Design a protein around this ligand. Structure first.
Ligand SMILES: [Zn+2]
Length: 182
């Protein structure tokens, strides 16, 4: 379970139902709290944008794997010890967790900076939890909210009102993926 890179051709193409997606958000939270108790340091909880009902695809793995490398190089850059790291596939698709012995805020700012500066940064959902279980946000620091993959507006406004077509979100993912993996 320690190992972290998810081989893309072994993707499950598991079609997740709506109530299976709604159930897994509760297992996530519970799993997140077990890591915080086993290692009381901030935790990065990392999933990939996976718009459809099939969220464990070859595309989503290649994207998850690029994030793994970048999370580790960020840890090394900031001089932050990873105490535990694991990956899995859940109802939200590829998922990773890293217990990092760092200040929670620095960690959240670093991962914000990563989502912006990295060529694939907008396919990553890099959450950061404090040991108390508080999920840190851009709003805690009066930062602009995460913007939508497809236009200028905030992600939440475009996801609430299904503004953008699912094929467009997917085609963008392939497109960003192909501009990097050149
Ligand atoms: Zn939009």
């Amino acid at each position: 379970g320690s190992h972290m890179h998810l081989l893309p051709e072994l993707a499950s193409h598991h079609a997740v139902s709506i109530p299976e997606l709604l159930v897994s958000r509760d297992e996530r939270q519970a799993r997140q709290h077990v890591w915080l108790k086993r290692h009381p340091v901030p935790l990065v909880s990392f999933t990939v944008v996976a718009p459809g009902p099939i969220k464990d695809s070859e595309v989503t793995r290649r994207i998850f794997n690029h994030g793994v490398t970048a999370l580790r190089a960020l840890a090394a850059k900031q001089g932050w010890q990873i105490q535990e790291q694991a990956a899995l596939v859940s109802a939200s698709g590829p998922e990773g967790m890293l217990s990092i012995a760092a200040p929670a805020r620095d960690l959240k700012l670093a991962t914000i900076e990563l989502e912006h500066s990295h060529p694939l940064g907008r396919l990553w959902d890099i959450d950061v939890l404090t040991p108390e279980g508080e999920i840190l946000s851009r709003r805690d620091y009066s930062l602009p909210p995460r913007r939508c993959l497809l236009c200028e507006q905030s992600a939440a406004v475009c996801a609430r009102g299904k503004t953008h077509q699912l094929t467009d979100l997917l085609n963008r993912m392939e497109a960003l993926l192909n501009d990097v993996d050149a």
